Ligand binder design. Structure first.
Ligand code: NA
Length: 227
């Protein structure tokens, strides 16, 4: 398909986010590259407004599922690439158990040769001494399953999944995710059978970077359909 072809090689990525969490206003800029052939991306994020007012891990899912590796037998289920280059709207509600929630709206599309993720994030009802505003989450990331289903009335998809954030005491902060994607343009899109994405992430720091930042290495493979 047209959109699939745009991902056969290494594609530069830009991420831009404006956020407001409990009245704390912030912005983040990210850059790196993806290669969907291997389900791989690498990104570095900088908080351009000073200190990030929430833990970096809480924003990983918000900061390009078009870089997932879809096995060849599953390529007919790849909504994300099929929407390109015009792209898709990705909306989420992220519910932090016993704490606040993020509501996000992003547009993912090409600008020239570059894959861009532009996001607005709103967080409400966080506790001042919860794990988010209290900065009690460890700087690391677990491996998850993202469950995808078609949304035929919107010519898009939905997804549901549970992110587990390690807390520095040994406990876990659950972040339930609900997601909806809808196409921006008027090209044909692929409406998938039920499947999931298997994710893994590693978070690091650039030892030469003094601004508040996060380096992400991420791999994602579509699964849950045999052969
Ligand atoms: Na633990």
């Amino acid at each position: 398909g047209k959109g699939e072809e745009l991902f056969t090689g290494v594609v530069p990525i830009l991420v831009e986010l404006d956020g407001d969490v409990n009245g704390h206003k912030f912005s983040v800029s990210g850059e790196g590259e993806g290669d969907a052939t291997y389900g791989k991306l690498t990104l570095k994020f900088i908080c351009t407004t000073g200190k990030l007012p929430v833990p970096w891990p809480t924003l990983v899912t918000t900061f390009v599922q078009c870089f997932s590796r879809y096995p060849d037998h599953m390529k007919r289920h790849d909504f994300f690439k099929s929407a390109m280059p015009e792209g898709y709207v990705q909306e989420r509600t992220i519910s932090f158990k016993d704490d606040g929630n993020y509501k996000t709206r992003a547009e993912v599309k090409f600008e020239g040769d570059t894959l861009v993720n532009r996001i607005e994030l709103k967080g409400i009802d966080f506790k001042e001494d919860g794990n988010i505003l209290g900065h009690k989450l460890e700087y690391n990331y677990n491996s998850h399953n993202v469950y995808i289903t078609a949304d035929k009335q919107k010519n898009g998809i939905k997804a549901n999944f549970k992110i587990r954030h390690n807390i520095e005491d040994g406990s876990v902060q659950l972040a339930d995710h609900y997601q909806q994607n809808t196409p921006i343009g008027d090209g044909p899109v692929l409406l998938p059978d039920n499947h999931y994405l298997s994710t893994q992430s590693a978070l690091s720091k650039d030892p030469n970077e003094k601004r508040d930042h996060m380096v992400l290495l991420h791999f994602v493979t579509a699964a849950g359909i045999t052969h």
